[PDB]
Design a protein around this ligand. Structure first.
Ligand SMILES: Cc1ncc(C[n+]2csc(CCO)c2C)c(N)n1
Ligand SMILES: [Mg+2]
Ligand SMILES: [Mg+2]
Length: 366
């Protein structure tokens, strides 16, 4: 007896997640084996035999439209009120939940403690007035000069453009219809141009030969650059120096930030029609998203002395972690603001991204 399950693997330590899930699942279903698949939502739709899987909510509309996801009755969501509303709502279409949020994520502006100028920035335009252009092609920035930021990914940049549109238009949208790439919003794309100019084009588009996803976080701690924009989980590689840094969200426009968060959310395959198996999958989905699993997945363990610093979607996890790791107290203040929105895109995202990768990149190459 078996379930095929994919966890979200773009995290500092997916092994800690696997062990946490295995441990909590085994306590409840000692006679059902978990088959852990490496499945990549960014590359392809879920196979019919993938029973339970964690995916980026940008694909939610697509997955629901194609009918890949079973509805999850609200009574089948354990401790539902402990979940951050914007995240649960982001998983809810026309009154029905189609996923349970597990992780949320957003880019932060990181600055060094004592750098009051940077910490008072509200937007990338404020940041630019402070940093100016980095006009070198050096991948390695000078000490305390320039912006560290990873703009190497095609998909990431397209997503940044969407985020930029929302801050520029000052309207949150789920992009049921995705933007026209023949007529780019000049202001919104200007924000990406500015970011790249503060970083230098070479450093902005750099991917390291050793595939270290957090290399810029280490450079930053070592004194390279004036400021660093990256995800909260970058602090997982900052060691004790995480305590010597400040962080905040900033707007991609000259207007007030609409704080957009990626959601990594757990769905259950609609191909499951056997009600017993269906019950087991709903149980697994809750275990993947419950408090104890998240605490174990995120905290240090025998092989890892620092937290992952991923943002949970449950209040209770922050409370538990915040006693032991005070940075989580600060992260909670960012995570719990009622004006937070989950990053959603329409059903046709895959084709749009294909075209957008090329269009946004070539624009930024000028
Ligand atoms: C914890 C976490 N961090 C970042 C993202 C967003 N994200 C990660 S990889 C990628 C593009 C393809 O690699 C995007 C958009 C997320 N969903 N979850
Ligand atoms: Mg691929
Ligand atoms: Mg924003």
């Amino acid at each position: 007896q078996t379930l095929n399950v994919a966890l979200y693997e773009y995290v500092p330590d997916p092994i800690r997640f696997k062990k946490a899930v295995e441990t909590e699942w085994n306590k409840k279903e000692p006679n059902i084996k978990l088959n852990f698949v490496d499945w990549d939502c960014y590359s392809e739709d879920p196979p019919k035999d993938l029973d339970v899987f964690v995916f980026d909510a940008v694909y939610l509309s697509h997955f629901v439209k194609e009918g890949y996801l079973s509805e999850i009755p609200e009574k089948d969501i354990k401790n539902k009120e402990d979940i951050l509303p914007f995240a649960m709502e982001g998983c809810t279409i026309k009154g029905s939940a189609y996923a349970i949020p597990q992780i949320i994520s957003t880019n932060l502006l990181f600055s060094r403690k004592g750098d009051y100028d940077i910490q008072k920035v509200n937007s990338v335009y404020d940041l630019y007035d402070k940093l100016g252009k980095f006009t070198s092609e050096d991948i390695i920035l000078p000490n305390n000069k320039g912006l560290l930021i990873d703009m190497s990914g095609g998909t990431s940049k397209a997503c940044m453009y969407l985020d930029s549109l929302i801050d520029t238009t000052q309207e949150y949208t789920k992009f049921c219809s995705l933007p026209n790439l023949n007529e780019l919003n000049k202001d919104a794309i200007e924000s990406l141009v500015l970011l790249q100019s503060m970083a230098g084009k070479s450093q902005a588009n750099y991917w390291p030969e050793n595939n270290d996803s957090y290399i810029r976080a280490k450079w930053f701690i070592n004194g390279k650059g004036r400021a660093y924009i990256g995800y909260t989980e970058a602090m997982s590689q900052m060691k004790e120096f995480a305590n010597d840094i400040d962080f905040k969200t900033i707007s991609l426009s000259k207007n007030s930030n609409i704080p957009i968060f990626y959601g990594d959310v757990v769905g259950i395959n609609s191909s499951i029609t056997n009600s017993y198996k269906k019950e087991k999958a709903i149980e697994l989905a809750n275990i993947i998203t419950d408090k104890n699993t998240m605490v174990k997945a995120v905290s240090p363990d025998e092989n890892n002395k620092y937290p992952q610093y991923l943002l949970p979607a449950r209040r209770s996890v922050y409370h538990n972690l915040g006693n032991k790791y005070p940075i989580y107290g600060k992260l909670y203040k960012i995570a719990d603001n009622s004006n937070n929105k989950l990053f959603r895109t329409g059903p046709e995202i895959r084709e749009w991204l294909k075209q957008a990768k090329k269009i946004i990149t070539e624009y930024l190459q000028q």
